[PDB]
Point group: D2
């Protein structure tokens, strides 16, 4: 049994259920995901929770993250996942298309003090953009 | 309106419903899809109905092709679709993985005599293979 | 003859030659690429120039960006490009892998005052990472 | 591993275009079902015409780079990347002259110490995108 992989699976489950009441259990106070720096200055459990909320709002309550595979090496965990969603919310200046999409993701997680301390994630931006009909942005904001 | 695009949409719906009673309406008697040459020597509506049945049996009755976009140029149609399924039957000598998957597909269809005459399709093999957990074949035959 | 497309082509050639002396001609003073917020607080011609220099340093002097196609819609340009390189510098806490790679990219450019004002780009992260041999990070930094 | 060594020679053959010695590692009953549309050949002769077709269509400078290779019993799985330039006719599409690069997965079955079954999955969609998504001029 890996506590690290268990913790990462709790993180995946949060995106699925949208339930983040217990996020402080597994998200470090100093948690950072550099991928959302454009959108927020938050850190820690608050940052992770708001990103979950963003996924649920932009990609619908039916948005799911399926596990392909998870592995670990020392204090790091790598997760191979697949996002399923429907584009119901505005995203980087693009109006909702209402279109279904699915895309692989890779997530890289560093543990510090038994908690997720750094989180990088790579969506399949181009593949998702294609499935969304390659919308033109209506603004840069 | 385009009759060709309409015919390609009927083709897509046949994969989705598994209903193939009427395939002779839009599939040419000389219909060929070179992608299944390995598995069968069939042609025409017969080939198409078998391939539909293969999809339903292998990727489950819930297997679905969603339309992203379809364009046409003269007697040719190009469809951008996404396949969704669960791997529940043997395929190319790999045992069922039970794995959900989804992958974009490009289809190229040539119309002749008002019917789909040639059909090339490109699954996202590698993308799907990853989602299946990259299974090793148990055999190069049937099994 | 689109001046916007010509400007985006000069931008592409900059990554190719590594020459940034003239970037003020086509990069807006308030130019932003949100993709590099993790790495730098720079803006304008200076931000664009350091990012080109980053590419040449990390993906080698031989790194090339190839044009597949470029379209425009009003004050916006969308470029379909392909990056070729070899991973020779540190990148997000990963040691250099020395690996060749190539990945499609989508770039979205907003023009203001006849210069590039906003720039978003989507590398094929997962495809590239596979070609890199999927390295584990040595640090989060 | 002699199997991995044999698969590396196979990869080298695409790179050099040199097919003189393919009978060394290609089984007399060698099949690649991906080319059934284009030829009825089998064995070393099939493998050799497929390498020639690659050199002809994707240029003499076309090459396969290795990402990783692994094996399980009598099977080898090779993760590769094709680099090429589209200079020859291909499934009814005229040469675009365009550069492209795409990952491939190859699955090889060994029988009697030689490559007997060969399946390969190009990144068709990604390559097609890099080629400008040309429309075919003919089905044949
Ligand atoms: C035009 O859409 C995107 O930029 C996009 C695409 C194509 C694919 C994706 O998977 C995401 C986004 C954008 C995006 C997020 C995506 O996953 C995201 O998770 C995301 C987030 O988790 C928090 C704030 C903003 C976000 C985004 O703007
Ligand atoms: C091991 O998996 C495959 O070969 C495969 C993958 C990775 C992705 C795919 O989309 C397909 C297949 C195999 C396959 C078919 C796929 O779509 C298919 O439609 C298919 C078919 O329609 C009729 C006979 C055989 C078939 C296959 O062997
Ligand atoms: C581990 O690799 C990456 O993070 C990465 C990958 C997989 C693919 C890519 O294309 C890029 C990066 C990272 C990266 C940049 C990539 O293109 C980049 O352009 C980049 C940059 O232009 C300026 C600062 C940092 C950068 C990066 O960290
Ligand atoms: C329109 O392009 C293709 O069909 C194609 C694409 C998009 C990507 C590819 O990698 C290949 C082909 C076509 C193709 C081969 C590709 O790799 C190939 O190796 C190939 C071959 O090895 C022998 C005969 C025909 C072949 C092809 O028609």
């Amino acid at each position: 049994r890996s506590e690290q992989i268990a913790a990462v699976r709790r993180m995946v489950e949060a995106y699925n259920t949208g339930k983040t009441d217990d996020v402080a259990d597994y998200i470090h106070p100093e948690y950072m995901n550099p991928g959302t720096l454009e959108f927020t200055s938050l850190r820690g459990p608050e940052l992770f929770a708001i990103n979950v909320a963003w996924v649920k709002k932009t990609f619908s309550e039916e948005a799911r993250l399926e596990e392909v595979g998870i592995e670990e090496r020392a204090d790091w965990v790598r997760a191979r996942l697949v996002l399923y969603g429907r584009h119901v919310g505005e995203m980087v200046g693009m109006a909702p298309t209402g279109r279904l999409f699915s895309g692989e993701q890779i997530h890289l997680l560093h543990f510090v003090d038994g908690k997720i301390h750094h989180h990088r994630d790579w969506p399949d931006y181009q593949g998702t953009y294609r499935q969304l009909g390659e919308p033109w942005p209506e603004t840069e904001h």
